[PDB]
Design a binder for this molecule. Sequence first.
Ligand SMILES: CCCCCCCN(CCc1ccc(O[C@@](C)(CC)C(=O)O)cc1)C(=O)Nc1ccc(F)cc1F
Ligand SMILES: CCCCCCCO[C@@H]1O[C@H](CO)C(O)C(O)C1O
Length: 260
Amino acid sequence: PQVADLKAFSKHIYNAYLKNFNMTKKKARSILTGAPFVIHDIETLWQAEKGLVWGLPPYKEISVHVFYRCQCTTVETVRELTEFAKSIPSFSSLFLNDQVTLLKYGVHEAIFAMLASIVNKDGLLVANGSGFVTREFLRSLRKPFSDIIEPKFEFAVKFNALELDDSDLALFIAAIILCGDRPGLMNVPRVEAIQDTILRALEFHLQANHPDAQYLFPKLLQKMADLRQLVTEHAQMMQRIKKTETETSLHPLLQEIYKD
Ligand SMILES: CCCCCCCN(CCc1ccc(O[C@@](C)(CC)C(=O)O)cc1)C(=O)Nc1ccc(F)cc1F
Ligand SMILES: CCCCCCCO[C@@H]1O[C@H](CO)C(O)C(O)C1O
């Protein structure tokens, strides 16, 4: 009945996910278990840069160059998240303006959620798996660039402890985007209703895919809550970069998200 009709709904979201995201956690963990060129310093960064692994703003500095790469990566993940969102029927039913409102306020949360998929205790994949940047190298970046990405690792390791597969993620992400709590959201009841359908689908999907997993569901709800905080602290550091990092330019689409 309920538990039957939702299976469908869940598989459909999983297909949108497989169809749209550049990198699946399956593909990610694989590469991270088994190779990618390791970037742990300037030498290897310049190396990776040239041809080793790899249209950015004019060079300016090491730490900033990385910041720019982060931007390029984020912009690309925002494009996927958008396509993924549109691949969910109920999401497209919404007026174009509300769709943009959900993406505007939910993508970073989604992005940091998925970041966990390509991240292990020591670093993270880059360039479609082609390379691996060390966590220690990021930490060495001149501040404030060295602070921004570190909290994400902390988040990611705990998150990865839940051992979620791509099918769980598709639903988890969907839940994040379809959140009726977003500012200026127009058809709040509609969004809320879709979110609920997603959460119920998620739970049923979890007791199936993770039989013996104790408190998985409510734990995921807390993670959503955490991502909300993670993004908030991220936005704060971002305002500090816009204030003090006068020379560092910001991608237009990213400024639109961070303006209000
Ligand atoms: C050696 C090259 C190093 C490359 C490092 C790239 C690290 N980085 C960006 C994290 C980040 C950093 C800053 C960030 O801040 C900005 C301002 C900039 C994008 C934003 O909030 O939009 C947002 C997000 C990622 O790998 N991101 C990433 C990739 C796939 C995915 F599914 C989810 C992800 F978060
Ligand atoms: C590509 C989908 C994700 C887009 C995220 C960025 C959206 O920015 C917002 O665009 C709205 C509609 O145009 C406004 O009117 C704003 O004021 C604004 O900041």
